[PDB]
Coordinates of C-alpha atoms and ligand atoms in Angstrom, one line a residue:
Chain A
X1 CA 0.0 0.1 0.2
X2 CA 3.2 2.0 -0.1
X3 CA 2.7 3.0 -3.5
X4 CA -0.1 5.7 -2.9
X5 CA 0.9 7.7 0.2
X6 CA -0.2 5.3 3.0
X7 CA 2.1 4.5 5.8
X8 CA 1.9 2.7 9.2
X9 CA 3.5 4.5 12.3
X10 CA 5.2 2.4 15.2
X11 CA 3.6 2.2 18.6
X12 CA 5.6 4.2 21.5
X13 CA 5.7 1.2 24.0
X14 CA 7.2 -2.0 22.3
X15 CA 6.1 -5.5 23.0
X16 CA 8.9 -6.2 25.5
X17 CA 8.0 -3.0 27.4
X18 CA 4.5 -4.3 27.6
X19 CA 5.4 -7.6 29.1
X20 CA 7.5 -6.0 31.6
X21 CA 4.7 -4.1 32.8
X22 CA 2.5 -7.2 33.1
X23 CA 5.2 -9.2 35.0
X24 CA 5.6 -6.6 37.4
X25 CA 1.9 -6.4 38.0
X26 CA 2.0 -10.3 38.5
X27 CA 5.0 -10.0 41.0
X28 CA 3.1 -7.5 43.1
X29 CA -0.1 -9.5 43.4
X30 CA 1.6 -12.7 44.2
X31 CA 4.0 -11.4 47.0
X32 CA 1.9 -8.5 48.3
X33 CA -1.8 -9.0 47.7
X34 CA -3.6 -5.7 47.2
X35 CA -1.2 -3.5 49.1
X36 CA 1.1 -2.5 46.3
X37 CA -1.8 -0.7 44.6
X38 CA -2.3 1.5 47.5
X39 CA 1.2 2.5 48.7
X40 CA 4.3 0.5 49.4
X41 CA 4.3 -3.2 48.7
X42 CA 4.0 -5.2 52.1
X43 CA 5.0 -8.9 51.9
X44 CA 2.7 -11.6 53.0
Chain B
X1 CA 15.7 -7.6 -11.6
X2 CA 13.2 -9.9 -9.8
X3 CA 12.9 -13.5 -8.7
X4 CA 9.5 -13.6 -10.4
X5 CA 9.0 -15.5 -13.5
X6 CA 5.8 -15.5 -15.6
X7 CA 4.0 -16.9 -18.7
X8 CA 5.1 -15.5 -22.2
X9 CA 2.0 -14.0 -23.2
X10 CA 2.0 -11.9 -19.8
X11 CA 3.5 -8.3 -19.9
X12 CA 3.1 -6.9 -16.4
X13 CA 2.0 -7.8 -13.0
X14 CA -0.7 -6.4 -10.5
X15 CA -1.2 -7.2 -6.9
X16 CA -4.4 -7.3 -4.4
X17 CA -5.4 -3.9 -4.8
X18 CA -4.4 -3.6 -8.8
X19 CA -1.3 -1.8 -8.4
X20 CA 1.5 -2.4 -11.0
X21 CA 4.5 -4.2 -9.4
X22 CA 6.3 -5.8 -12.1
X23 CA 7.0 -5.3 -15.9
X24 CA 8.5 -7.1 -18.9
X25 CA 11.1 -5.4 -20.9
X26 CA 9.9 -5.5 -24.6
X27 CA 13.4 -6.2 -25.9
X28 CA 15.3 -8.5 -23.4
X29 CA 12.4 -10.4 -22.0
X30 CA 13.4 -9.9 -18.3
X31 CA 11.2 -9.1 -15.5
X32 CA 11.7 -6.0 -13.4
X33 CA 10.4 -5.1 -10.0
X34 CA 8.9 -1.9 -9.3
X35 CA 9.1 -0.1 -5.7
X36 CA 8.0 3.5 -5.2
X37 CA 10.8 6.3 -4.7
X38 CA 11.2 7.4 -1.1
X39 CA 8.5 9.5 0.5
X40 CA 7.8 10.4 4.1
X41 CA 7.0 13.2 6.6
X42 CA 9.1 15.8 8.2
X43 CA 8.7 16.4 11.8
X44 CA 10.2 19.1 14.0
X45 CA 10.9 18.9 17.6
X46 CA 10.9 22.1 19.6
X47 CA 11.2 22.8 23.3
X48 CA 8.9 25.7 22.7
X49 CA 9.9 29.2 21.6
Ligands
NAG101 C1 15.6 -7.0 -30.3 O1 16.9 -6.8 -30.8 C2 17.9 -7.1 -30.0 C3 19.0 -6.8 -30.6 O2 19.8 -5.7 -29.8 C4 17.8 -8.5 -29.4 O3 18.9 -8.8 -28.5 C5 16.6 -9.0 -29.0 O4 16.8 -10.4 -28.7 C6 15.4 -8.4 -29.8 N1 14.2 -9.0 -29.3 C7 13.2 -9.5 -29.9 C8 13.7 -10.3 -31.3 O5 12.1 -9.9 -29.2

């Protein structure tokens, strides 16, 4: 489609940046419960 | 020069949206590719005047 003036722009976060965000949400839940989404992570 | 080879009565090629993307030279029966010349946008990053 590049012949007629159409282009595709890349996203700002890559796929490895989004995978780093979801593994930090997983580790916070497994080690702290719901405390890390309200302040400091408190282990339990 | 392309890695495409087609039937000897065909002159040029088209794709899914009917854009010409290959052609045969009418003297040396060779199959050339066609790609567009380079285009794009120009963006200016300013910290504010
Ligand atoms: C056209 O003439 C050229 C002579 O330079 C020859 O190489 C080519 O094969 C010819 N094409 C034909 C007869 O289709």
